[PDB]
């Protein structure tokens, strides 16, 4: 059903009289490679607990990606903080031309041919968030049609 | 299920410091205080109540929230005067949003209703005997109405969205329809079914909240006569 991908895991530290106190951050992608993708970022005392928490959170955050012959209905450029993502539609045979973060998402989203580009802050966390916002914003001829029918 | 000249209260409420959004529902300001346009109060009732009956005559569970100490009694009654649960005292963080958790409190309250009526009542010195005394006490004060909910309500009937803002926000988040009696100092856009009118003055809080339970009953066919809250209206 849903395939999970781990974007990254960081160790993060905090301070107390005595020393440092770690936590673990986990960014996890989940999708059915059939138009549904979810992002999840969970943290916990230990990695596993974190990951699991991430996965659990991903499923809580789903996006309905309007796949088309394997690509996206058009181009969007989304800015999440200092990270900017650029998604450009492509023909078949192209493949998923993207950095690891946007890829993992696009792939589990069902996207198969797409032109991508990371601009601004390359921060994986905000890039991944930038992506979901991009996809989430994709519209369709029918969608526009609906909106401008009035 | 009617009445138009209900100017017996409502309208004109909350000094000038409003919320421009609620401006659509305002008639005018006289000697300070915005006066809610009743013609519209009506219009909204019609639509809101519809949503109510429809979801009422379908076995819909509705949670009533009215902490405003002002109309803090006119709520539990009409609530109890229907299956409907209620939050009378204070709204807690997670009622709906952390429901699976806060439910453990209820699945603990009825858990004490037990002990406080068995052979174990006389156990452990007052030490562990008094800890569990207060244990109940409070629960029964906060979870008196939240007792009934066994799953997120199909809707929420808030009396003052602004006051009961945390609640509304949780409905919203969980796509739980939000019905609410609101006025001049609130963000209508957050109320799915608005009952624009006096958010204060028990008289007005009664007239509406009351009739709402009427239509709830009438819809559930079990037709009933007047309500016993008209007493606290003094």
């Amino acid at each position: 059903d849903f395939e999970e991908k781990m974007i990254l895991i960081r160790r993060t530290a905090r301070m107390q009289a005595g020393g440092r106190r770690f936590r673990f951050g986990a960014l996890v992608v989940v999708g059915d490679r059939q138009g549904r993708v979810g992002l999840g970022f969970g943290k916990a005392p230990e990695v596993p607990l974190a990951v699991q928490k991430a996965g659990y959170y991903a499923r809580r955050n789903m996006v309905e990606v309007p796949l088309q012959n394997g690509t996206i209905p058009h181009e969007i450029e989304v800015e999440f903080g200092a990270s900017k993502i650029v998604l450009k539609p492509a023909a078949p045979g192209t493949g998923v031309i993207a950095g690891a973060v946007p890829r993992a998402i696009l792939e589990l989203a069902g996207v198969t041919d797409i032109l991508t580009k990371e601009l601004g802050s390359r921060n994986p966390i905000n890039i991944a968030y930038a992506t979901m916002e991009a996809l989430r914003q994709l519209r369709t001829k029918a969608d526009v049609e609906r909106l401008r029918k009035g | 299920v009617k009445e138009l000249l209900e100017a017996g209260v409502h309208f004109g409420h909350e000094r000038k410091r409003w919320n421009p959004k609620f401006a659509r529902y305002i008639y005018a300001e006289r000697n300070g205080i915005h006066i809610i346009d009743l013609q519209k109060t009506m219009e909204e009732l019609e639509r809101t109540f519809r949503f109510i009956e429809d979801l009422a005559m379908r076995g819909g569970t509705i949670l009533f929230v009215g902490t405003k100490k002002q109309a803090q009694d006119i709520v539990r009654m009409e609530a109890e005067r229907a299956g409907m649960p209620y939050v009378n005292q204070r709204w807690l963080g997670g009622m709906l949003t952390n429901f699976k958790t806060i439910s453990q409190r209820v699945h603990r309250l009825e858990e004490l209703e037990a002990l406080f009526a068995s052979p174990e009542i006389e156990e452990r010195p007052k030490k562990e005997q008094v800890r569990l005394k207060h244990e109940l006490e409070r629960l029964q004060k906060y979870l008196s109405g939240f007792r009934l909910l066994k799953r997120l309500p199909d809707a929420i009937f808030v009396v003052d969205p602004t006051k009961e803002a945390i609640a509304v926000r949780e409905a919203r988040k969980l796509f739980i329809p939000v019905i609410a009696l609101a006025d001049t100092d609130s963000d209508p856009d957050l109320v799915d079914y608005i009952i624009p009118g006096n958010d204060d003055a028990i008289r007005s809080i009664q007239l509406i909240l009351s009739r709402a339970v009427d239509l709830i009953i009438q819809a559930r066919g079990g037709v009933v006569e007047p309500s016993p809250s008209y007493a606290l209206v003094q």
């Binding site: 078949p92 045979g93 493949g95 998923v96 031309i97 690891a100 | -």
Partner: protein, 208 residues
């Protein structure tokens, strides 16, 4: 040169059966057959999660290590495939499937691809009549891959084209066992091939 050396070791590193010996790779001995862990003093220790990079690298190797082509030629072919029309991944595979040494393999004139290659460089093969000793020679569609009479009487050719009797062959091909000749009918359609390779990943190893 083209590798030359411990081969059922590549099989092991790639963790899958690569047929670089034809026979024996079917017997209870291809090593992949009982001893599946990669070669070297470390092959049995628990493996660490491979980097996306590692995957494509290994994936490209798997595919290339199959046809015995050099990174050089492999790369050039892929580039040609990219520039060409049609879904590159597909086109790439077909282009590889068009190498003469390979056809000589598909047709069975030889057990393995390496053996096949030698049969080409040694002139035992013919294309439309004239002999061709270029393992990398690209076969067009309609060409007649064959054995040169002067070679039809060699013990190896015999055992080989014999074992081919009754044995069926790729749908994009055709074989006349007695005439020791076959035909390259069509560029194999991707679906016709059943290689243990996800070529999409290869296209990606070369995009980086």
């Amino acid at each position: 040169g083209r590798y030359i050396g411990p081969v059922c070791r590549l099989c092991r590193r790639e963790g899958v059966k690569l047929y670089l010996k034809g026979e024996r790779c079917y017997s209870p001995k291809c090593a992949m057959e009982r001893r599946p862990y990669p070669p070297g003093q470390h092959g049995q220790k628990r493996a660490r999660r491979p980097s996306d990079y590692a995957v494509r690298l290994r994936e490209k190797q798997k595919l290339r290590r199959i046809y015995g082509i050099s990174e050089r030629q492999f790369r050039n072919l892929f580039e040609e495939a990219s520039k060409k029309k049609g879904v590159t991944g597909s086109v790439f595979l077909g282009l590889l499937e068009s190498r003469l040494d390979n056809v000589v393999y598909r047709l069975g004139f030889a057990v393995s691809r390496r053996q096949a290659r030698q049969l080409v460089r040694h002139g035992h093969i013919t294309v439309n009549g004239r002999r061709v000793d270029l393992p990398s020679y690209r076969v067009r569609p309609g060409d007649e891959i064959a054995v040169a009479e002067k070679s039809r009487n060699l013990e190896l050719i015999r055992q080989n084209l014999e074992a081919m009797k009754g044995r069926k062959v790729g749908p994009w091909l055709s074989l006349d066992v007695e005439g020791m000749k076959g035909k390259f009918l069509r560029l194999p359609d991707r679906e016709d091939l059943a290689l243990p390779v996800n070529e999409q990943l290869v296209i990606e190893f070369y995009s980086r």
